[PDB]
Amino acid sequence: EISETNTIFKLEGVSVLSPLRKKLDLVFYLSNVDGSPVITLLKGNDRELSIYQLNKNIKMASFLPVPEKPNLIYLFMTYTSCEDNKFSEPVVMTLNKENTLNQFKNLGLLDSNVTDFEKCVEYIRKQAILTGFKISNPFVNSFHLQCHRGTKEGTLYFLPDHIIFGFKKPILLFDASDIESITYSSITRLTFNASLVTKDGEKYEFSMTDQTEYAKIDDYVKRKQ
């Protein structure tokens, strides 16, 4: 099923966080059934996860920064399952840039003395384009900040069309048009709480946001309304 012929691109040893924490190989290839592009995450020859019909089944795909780790980058994707019976499903992996660069040099995808990891991002985005989907790179307007959801810290990403709270379970993804309101409230002298409610009546509290980020968040919301 996966052969050297038929594989577009393979990245070994990516660190998958969701829907499981495991070091796996990312493979983009063409099905032998119909030649249709498939993304899978492999342990050895075994498949942990597959995404098929990428043209219609990939809903969201973005490179996102890892806060404080310039050494890493997230790839985040949501998808309808191969059997069209499971919807908006999240995958998150980190890529180590130094290793990704180095692997790319070994596969001859990049000349020996390439310093710039954004060359890898250009290639991967191109491989998505050829393969029927698009990966956004919204950060390289958008912003992200640390907050708590209860006792657990997480990160809030304010993207052109989505807000993400990631990436410990459960990852929250909000379409920007589903925000009904945000109400602000304070708890510290240097922080504020953001109470967000969605069109379906669900309320999420994001506590302890630095008040440097209020200006940004309010302007975001007002624009998206």
Interface contacts to Cl ion, rule CB under 5 A = 159-162
Interacting residues of 174 by C-beta distance below 8 A, sequence separation 6+:
162, 163, 164, 196, 198
**Residue appearing with tokens 């809903």:** 59
Could you tell me the smallest distance in angstroms from the CB atom of residue 137 to Cl ion?
11
Could you tell me the smallest distance in angstroms from the CB atom of residue 77 to Cl ion?
12
Q: Is 72 left (phi over 0), alpha (psi -120 to 50) or beta?
A: beta
Could you tell me the smallest distance in angstroms from the CB atom of residue 162 to Cl ion?
4
Could you tell me the smallest distance in angstroms from the CB atom of residue 159 to Cl ion?
4
Nearer to Cl ion, 109 or 179 (CB): 179
Distance CA 10, CA 41 (A): 10
For β-strands 46-51 and 37-43, DSSP reports them as antiparallel
How many of the other CB atoms lie within 10 Å of CB of 177?
10
- Torsion over CA of 9, 15, 17 and 19, rounded to 10 degrees? 40
Nearer to Cl ion, 13 or 160 (CB): 160
Task: Count how many Cα atoms sit within 13 Å of the Cα of residue 82 in the half-sphere of its side chain.
Answer: 10
Could you tell me the smallest distance in angstroms from the CB atom of residue 75 to Cl ion?
14
Nearer to Cl ion, 23 or 199 (CB): 199
Nearer to Cl ion, 97 or 162 (CB): 162
DSSP E strands, 3-139: 7-18, 22-30, 37-43, 46-51, 58-65, 72-79, 89-96
Nearer to Cl ion, 90 or 103 (CB): 90
Nearer to Cl ion, 63 or 192 (CB): 63
**209: helix, coil or strand?**
strand
Could you tell me the smallest distance in angstroms from the CB atom of residue 163 to Cl ion?
9
